[PDB]
Structure formats: structure tokens, C-alpha cells
Amino acid sequence: IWLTALKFLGKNLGKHLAKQQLAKL
């Protein structure tokens, strides 16, 4: 799937998601 776009972002958003939780950790 060429959605490496949602993924390219997802990884960024994910890192952010992680950071989001990380922020509390």
C-alpha cells in the first residue's frame, strides 16, 4: 500500500502520540 503517507505522518503523529503520553511519563 502506497499509504506510506498516512504512515509517514502516522510515524510523526505516532512519535507525537508517544510524546503525548511520554509528556506525562
Side-chain angles (χ1 to χ4, degrees):
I1 66 195
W2 359 258
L3 314 167
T4 346
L6 279 309
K7 288 35 183 67
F8 173 95
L9 241 75
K11 93 194 176 319
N12 286 7
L13 216 170
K15 256 57 113 55
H16 234 98
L17 235 301
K19 273 275 160 49
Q20 237 290 94
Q21 286 134 120
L22 197 74
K24 308 140 145 249
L25 280 314

